[PDB]
Amino acid sequence: MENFQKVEKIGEGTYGVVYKARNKLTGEVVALKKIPSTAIREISLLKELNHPNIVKLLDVIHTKLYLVFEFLHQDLKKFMDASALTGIPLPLIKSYLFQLLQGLAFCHSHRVLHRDLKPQNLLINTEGAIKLADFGLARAFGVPVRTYTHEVVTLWYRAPEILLGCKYYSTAVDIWSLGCIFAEMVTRRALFPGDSEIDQLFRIFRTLGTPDEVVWPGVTSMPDYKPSFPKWARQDFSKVVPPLDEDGRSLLSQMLHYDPNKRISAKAALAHPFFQDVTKPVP
Ligand SMILES: Cc1nnc2nc3ccc([N+](=O)[O-])cc3c(-c3ccccc3Cl)nc1-2
Questions:
Q1: Which domains are seen in the chain, by residue range?
Q2: Whole-angstrom distance, CA of residue 178 vs CA of residue 99
């Protein structure tokens, strides 16, 4: 840590504070996150899983646990807010989704889940790239109810199988989260802004329909499923994400499939016709 000069605090992660910092030797500017050997082993393995749309883990220092990350200047949440009045142009939305799916496809091919995808851990630069931060840390530390600052961890992007009590969920949970984020960029409003687990579930239910054995085999048997769940009817995506075109609505509906086994994969999504005219605009 004596190798680093903290430049400024740039935020608070789930697990610890994040600083902008400079390497005193190399002058390299990095992001420094300050936070059990099983966790150390898991994180170490993540150091080799490099991809251009994954925020690079440069180093792990343990003496307290410090993670040294590639630095980017802005997060997507701030950009979405800054864009709220005009909306992010479709071509940039399309480019960001395309890149995020490439990041998911890579990590998932290695059987690593993110588990807590949200706008606040997607980072962007002036060159039009977008990258996922905190990938893999959920398996290392778990996903708390509150952050280290007691802030409520958002439920808005949490897949329904997690909410319904499944212990062994899949890479599909990340596709769900990304679909929620996709819808949010398009409409400029959170798709399912739940303020508790049950409110989160019911918001999902009110839009996509209360799931049954027809749409989701095995659902009524899950740990936290209750037969007393109100039965809401499914709404049209035309009503959910106007004015997204039918290619976009088709892809989104597949990313939000209830059955995790049927939910579209990152690799399959990259081949969806929605990305036929994908380009790489700069923000
Ligand atoms: C890793 C990593 N590398 N560069 C980073 N740059 C940032 C620039 C702006 C903002 N911000 O909030 O304005 C946050 C970050 C974060 C970050 C901080 C707290 C919680 C989560 C995240 Cl992702 N992390 C970065």
A1: 1-73 (3.30.200.20), 74-283 (1.10.510.10)
A2: 11
* CB of 18 sitting under 6 A from ligand 1: yes
CB distance 35 to 54 below 8 Å: no
245 in active site: no
Residue with token string 């005219």? 277
State how far the Cα of 122 lies from the Cα of 130, in Å rounded to an integer. 7
- Point out residues after which the chain has a gap (C–N over 2.5 Å): 35, 63
Cβ of 11 closer than 6 Å to ligand 1, yes or no, is yes
Contact between 49 and 62 under an 8 Å Cβ cutoff? The reply is no
To test the pocket of ligand 1, the residue of 4, 69, 75 to mutate (highest count of ligand atoms within 8 Å of its CB) is: 75
Is the distance from the beta carbon of residue 74 to the nearest atom of ligand 1 less than 6 Å? Answer: yes
Header resolution in angstroms: 2.0
Experimental method: X-ray
